[PDB]
Amino acid sequence: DLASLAIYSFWIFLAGLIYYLQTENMREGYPLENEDGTPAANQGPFPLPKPKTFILPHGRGTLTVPGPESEDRPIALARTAVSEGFPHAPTGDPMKDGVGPASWVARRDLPELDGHGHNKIKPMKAAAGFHVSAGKNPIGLPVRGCDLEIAGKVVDIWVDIPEQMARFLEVELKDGSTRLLPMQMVKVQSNRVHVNALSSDLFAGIPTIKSPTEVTLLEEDKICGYVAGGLMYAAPKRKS
Amino acid sequence: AEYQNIFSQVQVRGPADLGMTEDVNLANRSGVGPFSTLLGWFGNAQLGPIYLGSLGVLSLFSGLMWFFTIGIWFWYQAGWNPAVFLRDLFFFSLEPPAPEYGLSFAAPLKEGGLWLIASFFMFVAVWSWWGRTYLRAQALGMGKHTAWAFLSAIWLWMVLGFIRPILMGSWSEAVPYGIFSHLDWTNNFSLVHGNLFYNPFHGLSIAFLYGSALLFAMHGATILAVSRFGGERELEQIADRGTAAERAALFWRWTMGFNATMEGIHRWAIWMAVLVTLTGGIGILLSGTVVDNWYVWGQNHG
Amino acid sequence: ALLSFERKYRVPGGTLVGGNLFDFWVGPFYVGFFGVATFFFAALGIILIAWSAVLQGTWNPQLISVYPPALEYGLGGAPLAKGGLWQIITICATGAFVSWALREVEICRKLGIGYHIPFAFAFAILAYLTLVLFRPVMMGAWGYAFPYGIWTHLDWVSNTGYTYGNFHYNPAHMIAISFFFTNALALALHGALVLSAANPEKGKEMRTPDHEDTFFRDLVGYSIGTLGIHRLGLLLSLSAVFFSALCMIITGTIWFDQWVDWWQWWVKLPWWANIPGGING
Numbered sequence: 001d002l003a004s005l006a007i008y009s010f011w012i013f014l015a016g017l018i019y020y021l022q023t024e025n026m027r028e029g030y031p032l033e034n035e036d037g038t039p040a041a042n043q044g045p046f047p048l049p050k051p052k053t054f055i056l057p058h059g060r061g062t063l064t065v066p067g068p069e070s071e072d073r074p075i076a077l078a079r080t081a082v083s084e085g086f087p088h089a090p091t092g093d094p095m096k097d098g099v100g101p102a103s104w105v106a107r108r109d110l111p112e113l114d115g116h117g118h119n120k121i122k123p124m125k126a127a128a129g130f131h132v133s134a135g136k137n138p139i140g141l142p143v144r145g146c147d148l149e150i151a152g153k154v155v156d157i158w159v160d161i162p163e164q165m166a167r168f169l170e171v172e173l174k175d176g177s178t179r180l181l182p183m184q185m186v187k188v189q190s191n192r193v194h195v196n197a198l199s200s201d202l203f204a205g206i207p208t209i210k211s212p213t214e215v216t217l218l219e220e221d222k223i224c225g226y227v228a229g230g231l232m233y234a235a236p237k238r239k240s
Numbered sequence: 241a242e243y244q245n246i247f248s249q250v251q252v253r254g255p256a257d258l259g260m261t262e263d264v265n266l267a268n269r270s271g272v273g274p275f276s277t278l279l280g281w282f283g284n285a286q287l288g289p290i291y292l293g294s295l296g297v298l299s300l301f302s303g304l305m306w307f308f309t310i311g312i313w314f315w316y317q318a319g320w321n322p323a324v325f326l327r328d329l330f331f332f333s334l335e336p337p338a339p340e341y342g343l344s345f346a347a348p349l350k351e352g353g354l355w356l357i358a359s360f361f362m363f364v365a366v367w368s369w370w371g372r373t374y375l376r377a378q379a380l381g382m383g384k385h386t387a388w389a390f391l392s393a394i395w396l397w398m399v400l401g402f403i404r405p406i407l408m409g410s411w412s413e414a415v416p417y418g419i420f421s422h423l424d425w426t427n428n429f430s431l432v433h434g435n436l437f438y439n440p441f442h443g444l445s446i447a448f449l450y451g452s453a454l455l456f457a458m459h460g461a462t463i464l465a466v467s468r469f470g471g472e473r474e475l476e477q478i479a480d481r482g483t484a485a486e487r488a489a490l491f492w493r494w495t496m497g498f499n500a501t502m503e504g505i506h507r508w509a510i511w512m513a514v515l516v517t518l519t520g521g522i523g524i525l526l527s528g529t530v531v532d533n534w535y536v537w538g539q540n541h542g
Numbered sequence: 543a544l545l546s547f548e549r550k551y552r553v554p555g556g557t558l559v560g561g562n563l564f565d566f567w568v569g570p571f572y573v574g575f576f577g578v579a580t581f582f583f584a585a586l587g588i589i590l591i592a593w594s595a596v597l598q599g600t601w602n603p604q605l606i607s608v609y610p611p612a613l614e615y616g617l618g619g620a621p622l623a624k625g626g627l628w629q630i631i632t633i634c635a636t637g638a639f640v641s642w643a644l645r646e647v648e649i650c651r652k653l654g655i656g657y658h659i660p661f662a663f664a665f666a667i668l669a670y671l672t673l674v675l676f677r678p679v680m681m682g683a684w685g686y687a688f689p690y691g692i693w694t695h696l697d698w699v700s701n702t703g704y705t706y707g708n709f710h711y712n713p714a715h716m717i718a719i720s721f722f723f724t725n726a727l728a729l730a731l732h733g734a735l736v737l738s739a740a741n742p743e744k745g746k747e748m749r750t751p752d753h754e755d756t757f758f759r760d761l762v763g764y765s766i767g768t769l770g771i772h773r774l775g776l777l778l779s780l781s782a783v784f785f786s787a788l789c790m791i792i793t794g795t796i797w798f799d800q801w802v803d804w805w806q807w808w809v810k811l812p813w814w815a816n817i818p819g820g821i822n823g
């Protein structure tokens with residue numbers, strides 16, 4: 001009967017759809033590798049899909065995936081066991097070396113652009129006439145780390161222009177230089193901004209940006225990685 | 241306690257954003273509406289602009305006429321009494337023609353005619369709105385995924401009010417316009433077809449409805465969990481994978497042994513959701529036209 | 543085997559129990575103390591389900607059903623073949639789910655990400671516990687819980703619903719359903735919007751979040767924005783499940799009559815109860 005035919009057909013369709021979805025989801029990170037970076041013997045039952053190409057706006061070229069995968073950065077970890085499946089120990093300072101939860105990806109060293117080809121994220125002082133429109137304005141507040149010491153003072157908010165949102169706080173340190181802190185990693189209070197992720201002595205080590213009025217995707221990844229890494233790696237200097 | 245990025249701590253505002261031009265007829269955009277600081281704690285504060293245009297006017301007019309046809313019928317049922325209108329608001333119902341009228345438009349106004357008129361306005365409102373989801377994407381040079389997804393919802397709506405009644409040979413098979421009465425119709429529909437729990441397309445529709453809540457909870461939480469690395473900037477993560485997309489993928493890989501990509505999760509999403517009404521519409525269309533009783537059908541497996 | 547970008551994240555640390563003892567992977571899966579716990583609970587529960595099947599006399603997945611103790615047992619223990627296995631399997635399931643959530647927490651810690659996902663999952667666990675634990679306890683018997691069987695659990699849904707008339711009339715159930723339908727609407731729209739921008743008309747450059755905002759503003763006059771839509775999907779899904787749990791925890795406890803009759807409170811408000819005309823006059 002027609003209903004039996006429909007349901008039988010549907011299950012065949014569904015199996016095909018899952019195969020499509022799973023292979024689409026193999027456009028990044030595959031082929032799977034051994035811990036030494038060579039191709040793994042067992043790739044599983046799904047093959048890689050035929051490549052697709054994204055045309056990027058503003059002359060930025062294209063992305064074709066799947067494509068050759070490479071980290072494009074040194075990774076300062078080493079094996080802790082003689083067989084596969086165990087953790088890899090940082091060989092240096094994992095916050096400085098950008099591994100574990102301090103990891104960053106070698107994204108393009110250019111800023112994300114809006115639909116008009118301008119820098120998506122700008123310090124609020126350079127964004128006409130962006131302003132704080134609700135909530136406690138954090139500009140001017142002292143910035144406290146998880147050791148409960150003051151690490152600096154907020155001197156601006158970096159804003160996403162097309163999306164009208166706060167993305168970073170720019171914090172001036174004791175030496176007069178500044179660093180960016182992800183808005184998602186700070187708590188704005190009445191009298192301070194508190195940063196649980198970092199003790200005050202780690203603020204200097206936040207990766208710096210090369211130009212003082214823009215931030216590239218690479219730099220954002222280094223900064224966001226470093227700050228989040230502090231939850232694990234500054235745990236000793238934190239602090240009931 | 242750590243900030244969880246469910247509500248924003250600080251809102252910022254700049255000049256009203258008038259949007260991308262591309263091929264849009266700017267003469268048809270309104271001005272911006274008010275900014276809402278309240279909305280701004282959770283999402284964007286900006287209201288408007290909205291695109292009008294003649295197809296838009298047609299949809300709005302037709303949709304308002306549907307609503308007002310039902311509402312005027314409700315006032316009539318209330319004996320034009322405001323207190324009774326509010327008291328019995330959920331009990332009023334605009335009902336389709338009796339079975340005797342078949343598919344004719346010969347039913348008197350108070351006995352099905354007004355339901356046909358309301359339904360005609362709804363048909364025009366929804367289909368002209370569908371055209372709009374297509375044309376607004378086209379004008380911006382975007383893919384047509386929204387129009388395709390909307391068509392899956394339209395499929396169930398069309399099956400319920402139009403295709404199934406036509407195949408059954410009477411408008412009396414369609415859904416009444418009323419809050420309680422449409423729930424009564426739904427219960428009755430299951431009882432009369434031998435319990436929809438036995439309809440495998442109903443079971444599938446449920447799997448996708450629950451699965452949509454599972455998947456949006458997973459994806460919403462994942463993106464918030466990696467918002468500290470810019471995770472919600474999904475388009476640029478697709479174009480240039482970052483530590484947000486990698487940590488998202490590895491959370492799921494380490495948890496359940498496989499994972500998505502920033503682009504591909506949105507394909508899981510669109511399909512999980514659209515399959516709710518695709519399977520649902522099939523299940524309903526087969527009911528009474530091909531299968532009179534799902535329990536009985538399931539005993540034969542076919 | 544590892545994803546091409548995976549090794550740099552596989553560092554030690556983040557465990558809640560056991561230090562480095564269980565800090566390792568099996569293939570793609572992270573283990574951890576709670577990986578071992580989930581395995582134990584899941585294995586035991588599955589073994590006990592297999593034993594229940596043997597006592598029931600079937601291996602057919604569509605027939606196996608583990609029933610809770612009959613109502614006469616109240617909140618006491620019951621013989622294994624007469625509800626006791628359900629009781630133990632329920633402890634196992636709860637252990638397995640809570641262990642799963644806590645293993646997710648360990649994974650979040652190692653990855654340096656927010657705890658949103660296991661927090662969200664906890665809502666599903668609380669809905670499950672509402673049905674098998676909180677509601678049965680409030681009502682005074684394990685037998686009010688649902689049986690573990692593919693088809694028999696649907697029998698329970700139907701029997702339970704119709705105990706209170708048409709269950710559609712439960713107002714918390716109406717709100718839950720509105721959240722489930724709105725969630726699927728939002729999920730379809732979110733998936734479509736991102737895909738429509740990433741996969742534009744042939745030969746065109748990827749669109750931007752600016753075009754995503756513009757599309758929605760053009761269409762409905764408002765865009766919730768790229769952060770807002772993920773907050774919204776999370777809220778709609780968790781609200782759907784919160785109101786689901788709520789609609790059941792009140793049913794059989796605070797309200798136990800026909801749900802349709804609850805609505806008489808509105809109809810009977812003194813200022814219009816007696817006015818002639820309409821449906822209710």
Ligand code: BCL
Nearest residue numbers: 393394397426427429430436442445446449520521523524
């Ligand atoms: C006693 C009741 C019966 C029952 C009878 C029905 C019937 C009858 C139907 C369902 C259907 C469904 N049932 Mg059932 N169902 C039962 C028990 C359940 C249970 C449970 C017990 O836990 C669950 C979870 C469900 C779940 C579901 C869904 C999976 C499915 C509807 C999907 C949907 O998104 O529709 C919501 C989406 C739509 C209706 C699409 C709307 C489309 C657009 C075009 C709307 C236009 C609106 C516009 C003009 C108004 C604008 C106003 C705005 C403010 C602008 N049912 C019992 C057995 N069920 C439907 C189905 O598909 O069945 C197979 C269906 O017809």
Ligand code: BCL
Nearest residue numbers: 666667669670699700702703708709710718719786787790
């Ligand atoms: C005739 C039947 C009655 C009816 C009777 C009832 C009854 C009775 C109940 C509902 C409940 C629901 N009904 Mg009703 N309802 C009916 C009509 C409908 C209709 C409709 C369109 O007509 C709809 C849309 C709904 C929808 C709803 C939802 C609000 C709610 C179900 C979701 C939920 O609780 O999730 C919550 C999610 C869970 C419980 C899932 C938890 C799972 C987790 C923790 C773990 C599982 C993992 C594991 C086993 C995985 C295996 C391993 C593999 C690797 C995968 N009902 C009719 C009128 N309804 C239920 C409810 O609210 O429950 C709280 C409920 O008990």
Ligand SMILES: CC[C@H]1c2cc3[nH]c4c(c3C)C(=O)[C@H](C(=O)OC)c4c3nc(cc4[nH]c(cc(n2)[C@@H]1C)c(C(C)=O)c4C)[C@@H](C)[C@@H]3CCC(=O)OC/C=C(\C)CCC[C@H](C)CCC[C@H](C)CCCC(C)C
Nearest residue numbers: 299300303304365366369389390393513514723726727730
């Ligand atoms: C994949 C299935 C899921 C789904 C998907 C879906 N729905 C869709 C779409 C998609 C992808 C859209 O693109 C389309 C949309 O535009 O969403 C924003 C839509 C949509 N789904 C909608 C509703 C809806 N979807 C439903 C469900 C679902 N939709 C499924 C769960 C339901 C349920 C669950 O019952 C409802 C009620 C609308 C929000 C929208 C279709 C809008 C439409 O067709 O409008 C026509 C009518 C009008 C233009 C006017 C309406 C009349 C009003 C009642 C009167 C008052 C409002 C008026 C507009 C105010 C203006 C006053 C002025 C004079 C100032």
Ligand SMILES: CC[C@H]1c2cc3[nH]c4c(c3C)C(=O)[C@H](C(=O)OC)c4c3nc(cc4[nH]c(cc(n2)[C@@H]1C)c(C(C)=O)c4C)[C@@H](C)[C@@H]3CCC(=O)OC/C=C(\C)CCC[C@H](C)CCC[C@H](C)CCCC(C)C
Nearest residue numbers: 450453454457584587634635638642662663665666691692
């Ligand atoms: C709260 C919103 C929605 C939600 C959220 C949610 N669910 C989640 C998550 C989140 C955020 C996860 O992180 C976790 C996950 O890893 O997903 C991939 C999960 C998950 N939700 C799942 C299922 C699920 N979620 C459901 C729904 C929902 N989940 C809600 C609608 C449903 C429904 C609606 O029926 C199901 C079936 C799993 C895919 C996964 C949790 C996996 C897990 O806990 O694994 C550990 C345990 C085992 C491997 C098996 C244990 C076996 C038991 C010991 C015995 C079986 C007892 C059982 C009670 C029998 C039931 C028989 C049925 C026929 C009734």
Ligand SMILES: COC(C)(C)C/C=C/C(C)=C/C=C/C(C)=C/C=C/C(C)=C/C=C\C=C(C)\C=C\C=C(/C)CC/C=C(\C)CCC=C(C)C
Nearest residue numbers: 307310311359360363397398400401402415417418419422
């Ligand atoms: C205060 O008073 C005011 C002025 C505001 C007016 C008050 C308004 C009120 C109270 C209105 C309330 C409206 C309500 C309660 C509406 C509820 C609608 C519901 C619950 C609908 C549910 C399902 C509807 C479906 C499935 C409809 C399907 C319809 C179609 C597919 C259209 C089919 C087309 C037909 C039959 C026309 C055929 C003719 C041609 C030429 C195509």
Ligand SMILES: CCCCCCCCCCCC[N+](C)(C)[O-]
Nearest residue numbers: 440442443444447451508511512
């Ligand atoms: C986007 C695709 C996701 C696939 C989810 C498939 C879940 C299948 C659920 C089984 C339902 C079986 N039944 C009894 C309804 O026929």
Ligand SMILES: CCCCCCCCCCCC[N+](C)(C)[O-]
Nearest residue numbers: 591603604606607608690691692
């Ligand atoms: C406690 C309920 C018993 C569950 C049995 C194990 C699940 C097996 C999956 C069902 C497969 C359906 N199938 C393939 C037989 O048709």
Ligand SMILES: CCCCCCCCCCCC[N+](C)(C)[O-]
Nearest residue numbers: 419712713714715716717718720
């Ligand atoms: C009318 C469409 C909106 C859907 C929401 C469902 C309405 C149910 C409201 C019940 C709440 C009554 N209560 C608790 C305030 O008294």
Ligand SMILES: [Fe+3]
Nearest residue numbers: 459463474736
């Ligand atoms: Fe997303």
